[PDB]
Amino acid sequence: STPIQQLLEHFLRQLQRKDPHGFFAFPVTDAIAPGYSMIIKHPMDFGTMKDKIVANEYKSVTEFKADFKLMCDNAMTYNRPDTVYYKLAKKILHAGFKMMSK
């Protein structure tokens, strides 16, 4: 485990605490979200992010933050603003970037 992997595991733990229902835990399936795979071209979720950390795919914090933002942006594209899923994505995007900067 490299120093970067250790830091990213720390950030990921802190980010996942902000999703207590686990809506972001695993890839979204079309059964749960009809037509999702044809609307969202670059899916992302915390489980995929964990696998990417362990596989050593993130070479910088910047690359990691971009996947986090992608995950939130996908949720704000697929879901309407008045939904639980949109609201959490907006909340966690802003809080997560703040947490990773302080």
Ligand X SMILES: C=CCCn1cc(-c2cccc(C(=O)N(C)C)c2)c2cc[nH]c2c1=O
Return residues touching ligand X (CB under 6 A): 21, 23-24, 28, 32-33, 75, 78-79, 85, 88-89
Least spacing, CB of residue 89 vs ligand X, in Å: 5
Shortest distance in whole angstroms from residue 87 CB to ligand X: 9
Q: Considering beta carbons, is residue 22 or 59 the nearer one to ligand X?
A: 22
**Cα separation of 45 and 48, whole Å?**
5
**Phi, psi dihedrals of residue 35, rounded to the nearest 5°:** 70, 10
The whole-angstrom separation of Cα 91 and Cα 102 is 17
- Element at 52 (helix H, strand E): helix 46-54
Nearer to ligand X, 30 or 63 (CB): 30
